[PDB]
Amino acid sequence: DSESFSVLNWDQVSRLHEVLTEVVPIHGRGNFPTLEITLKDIVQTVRGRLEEAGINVQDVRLNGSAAGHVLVKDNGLGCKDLDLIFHVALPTEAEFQLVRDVVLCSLLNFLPEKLKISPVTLKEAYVQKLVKVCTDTDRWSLISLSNKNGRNVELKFVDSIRRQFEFSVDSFQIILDSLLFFYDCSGNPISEHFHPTVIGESMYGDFEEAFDHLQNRLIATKNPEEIRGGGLLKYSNLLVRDFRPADQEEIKTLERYMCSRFFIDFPDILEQQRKLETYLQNHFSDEERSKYDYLMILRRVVNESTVCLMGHERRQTLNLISLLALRVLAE
Ligand SMILES: [Cl-]
Numbered sequence: 265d266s267e268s269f270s271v272l273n274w275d276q277v278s279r280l281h282e283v284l285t286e287v288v289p290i291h292g293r294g295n296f297p298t299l300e301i302t303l304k305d306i307v308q309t310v311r312g313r314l315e316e317a318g319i320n321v322q323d324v325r326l327n328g329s330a331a332g333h334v335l336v337k338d339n340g341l342g343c344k345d346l347d348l349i350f351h352v353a354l355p356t357e358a359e360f361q362l363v364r365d366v367v368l369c370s371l372l373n374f375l376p377e378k379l380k381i382s383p384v385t386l387k388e389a390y391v392q393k394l395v396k397v398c399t400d401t402d403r404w405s406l407i408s409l410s411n412k413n414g415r416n417v418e419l420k421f422v423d424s425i426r427r428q429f430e431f432s433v434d435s436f437q438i439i440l441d442s443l444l445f446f447y448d449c450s451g452n453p454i455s456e457h458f459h460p461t462v463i464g465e466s467m468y469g470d471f472e473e474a475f476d477h478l479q480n481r482l483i484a485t486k487n488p489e490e491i492r493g494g495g496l497l498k499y500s501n502l503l504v505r506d507f508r509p510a511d512q513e514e515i516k517t518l519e520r521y522m523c524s525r526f527f528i529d530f531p532d533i534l535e536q537q538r539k540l541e542t543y544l545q546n547h548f549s550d551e552e553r554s555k556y557d558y559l560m561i562l563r564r565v566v567n568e569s570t571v572c573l574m575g576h577e578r579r580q581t582l583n584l585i586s587l588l589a590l591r592v593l594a595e
Pocket residue numbers: 429490491492493494495
């Protein structure tokens with residue numbers, strides 16, 4: 265109900281406007297130039313061309329750390345990743361290809377003025393990753409832009425997705441539809457005296473409770489059973505950023521559960537290595553000290569919250585953590 269929603273104030277709406285209008289460079293591989301895009305322009309292009317092609321855009325939302333930064337300035341979670349969500353129905357395969365073609369066309373809008381241009385070519389030049397699932401329980405397409413700039417622009421087109429786990433401070437989404445309608449129809453720039461009503465939502469459950477957690481830098485969750493192997497990595501990211509567990513005397517039980525879930529999802533040691541290496545690159549680029557501190561946090565949780573039955577997995581994972589941290593110190 266309304267307990268998960270909240271109305272943004274001018275301070276939050278203003279920072280939302282800066283995030284959507286910030287010029288973000290998108291690195292181009294090869295002879296391709298860097299695209300200077302804004303979240304506002306790419307949303308308007310994608311949503312316009314989607315609805316023009318028969319795909320109704322139910323709503324557009326800002327997700328991730330950016331949504332947290334709009335609610336609380338400099339909360340400690342950073343502002344690298346710009347995550348966008350497009351609630352669109354994807355019944356058949358043709359809708360999935362249409363979503364890709366519209367995104368690649370949106371990149372063509374920012375391409376300045378000799379190169380060969382095509383959908384296959386634009387994907388190679390600017391799309392960092394493109395994952396796609398198409399089952400009865402999950403139907404969503406994700407397109408990420410090149411992150412050699414340092415920032416991660418993710419375009420997530422969700423039809424239906426079973427709820428993913430995140431802590432309170434990472435569960436904020438900002439519905440942009442009222443502000444996008446304002447961008448198209450306003451004759452004056454957005455101001456304190458004239459600005460639309462922007463709504464934020466916490467997928468955690470209670471906005472005020474989650475908002476208080478972000479204001480006091482607290483680690484909390486109400487659905488621990490939905491935690492999978494990645495939960496240990498999200499929890500360690502909050503710890504390295506000076507977020508304290510909001511419920512002491514309970515974190516020991518939660519840390520043990522997160523280590524067990526980590527080992528169940530990643531039994532192979534070579535699988536844990538590739539998961540950490542890609543995690544250290546997509547979260548702590550140009551932050552070698554943060555790479556070391558994150559691994560040392562991860563070592564402390566694994567060393568103190570792994571049961572006696574899994575001593576093999578504990579020693580094996582602790583050794584991998586040390587060798588990854590040693591390679592950071594070796595450079
Ligand atoms: Cl998880």
